[model samples]
Target chain A: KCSLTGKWTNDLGSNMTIGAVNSRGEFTGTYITAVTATSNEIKESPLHGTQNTINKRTQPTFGFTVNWKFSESTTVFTGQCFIDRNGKEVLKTMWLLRSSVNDIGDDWKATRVGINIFTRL
Target chain B: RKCSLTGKWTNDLGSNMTIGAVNSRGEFTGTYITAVTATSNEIKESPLHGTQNTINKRTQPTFGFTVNWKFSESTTVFTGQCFIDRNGKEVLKTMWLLRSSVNDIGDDWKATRVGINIFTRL
Candidate 1:
């Protein structure tokens, strides 16, 4: 059974540590981004998500949310986990970050999307 | 007992949502009927797909979902947190971004919209 209860790091040096997953597939963790546009100071943020299981095994499709304390934005990441041919655990995800907007007209630029790939640390 | 968002919900705007079964992976599907729209006067039911953050551990977990409008060419995405009120009622506080069809970069800002909603479980 593949478990997400471990430390993980992405290509951009962002680090995450997940806790134990409960019977309901809920888990909590902390994330520290190595790079940020707002400030160079690094801070750990709280994250929470649920994992799906298939035939009593953890599935690849999962999603999480990160609430950034330094920035006025929240990001939701939807991802799939995979094991490579070389026996490597990989996580590929797409994220949507909510940005602060002053007016409804500027809403077009309020949500940003990006991608990230993570590997076990 | 942990709270689950697997039922019916309605917002102050009179928009109603019905969430279907949520698998162990936290994925779910549902239908939404909005009280307000810019495209047509006729209110229509739209389909929604979303993922919940936590299932049983946290009483207040965050979630995100997307709504694909059948009557319009726009898509709206919502991110929210679920809270249990003092009276044991579940509420969802959400923020959404509605992406509109943009013909040009200069007029793109006129179509997209951003808003907030508070939903209570029915």
Candidate 2:
């Protein structure tokens, strides 16, 4: 079952739209961030990545990476997914963003911008 | 050839990677969740943690992918060659780097099989 292959929304005013998955186990999609204090505007960006599962059972664990450009900066979210016995999905991710300075000097600034408690809708 | 990559999988440390078919193109997709032991030594040492990967091409036995990773909180890239084992097990082997751009940390970026993720079939 492609549990992660749907739309996930969080309290942070974000929408994660996933792509169709197949036998090869490759998926891609996009995410839109809510307009809030950071910007006087609402932002929409594209995120593309892949994923794989740990087992073929109930409430399995999974991993994937989804990245997008925010404010002209590249940000990546690497997340682990959990499907509970009742089919509840949650994602815990590490968000990494490229520094604004020159590539090397800036390295990657890190954060946890999206923590997901998703429902299949 | 419905593969093992289309199912739920787990390793010894309880770290999980989920895979599913996105369409009818024999392509699959999923995510990796981290644990202290499930992640690589480099990832554990820095804030660089779980990232994303994608397999865009399939050549029968091997799949070609470019996966993004982190080390010392710096973005890194891994060109991967993944395949199913003779015993019908899913295996992923990756080459890790410190960062993608040119730098002084040349050989230091060379890491072989930083993650040999093998799925345990339930």
Candidate 3:
């Protein structure tokens, strides 16, 4: 049995897309986010009131993709993530697999970034 | 053939120096965590009281460093040879690896870390 589920805590949340696939070929996950605001703009509706308040940040986030396949006793996560921090957006595609179901020391492999990290659940 | 650096380490315990000029013969990685107290030695010092802090260890670990030495992937016994293990006034060195400047092929290999070894059997 393979699984992909972890909590991310930042000013925003997990800007990470997570996926999990079990060996016999069965399992998948994707990370999704959306931020929108509805409002009006006009001297009396000047060019239609602003769709949202300037003080708040709202918009449908860019779509990222991810899919995972299982092998033997390992579950792999493959996906793209676009996460929001304060008012910044960072993008990337990544792959991850824990050494165990609920532990760190797992490997998070990302191609674009040259970083080697050891993790535990 | 060794296509990757760092060894199949489980955690620290022990290294030397010498290289191919691509140098430092790398190992031992740590997460770039944002942790540092404001003052110097003050054992009784606290987090300024009620000051919310953190240590979630996040998802990304900027890993580096290990205590092993091997020149081949098929080798099992590690011989300590190439590392920068000096006392206090520690010598700091860094290395980065990636192949993006040119479109090329990529492959997977082995990795090791940890004070409490945990990983799927390779």
Model 1 per-residue lDDT tens digits across residues A3-28: 67899999889999999977645577
Better of 1 and 2 by DockQ: 1
Evaluate model 3: give its TM-score.
0.17
Candidate 2 lDDT, tens digit per residue, A28-115? 6677765332353545555545343323322222333333233423344444444445656654343333222222112223121323
lDDT of 1 by residue, B73-120 (tens): 555667766666557777776776565543332443364466788899
Q: Residue B9 of model 2: what lDDT?
A: 54
C-alpha TM-scores of all predictions: 0.54, 0.43, 0.17
lDDT of each: 0.66, 0.39, 0.18
DockQ of 3: 0.03
- Candidate 2 - CAPRI tier? incorrect
Best by TM-score: 1
What is the C-alpha lDDT profile of model 2 across B82-106, one tens digit per residue?
Answer: 3354565545433322222212212
**Alpha-carbon RMSD, candidate 2:** 15.3
> Candidate 3, residues A1-121: lDDT per residue as tens digits?
0112232222223233234322211222332212111131211100000011112222210111121111101112221122234433322212222221112112222112212211212
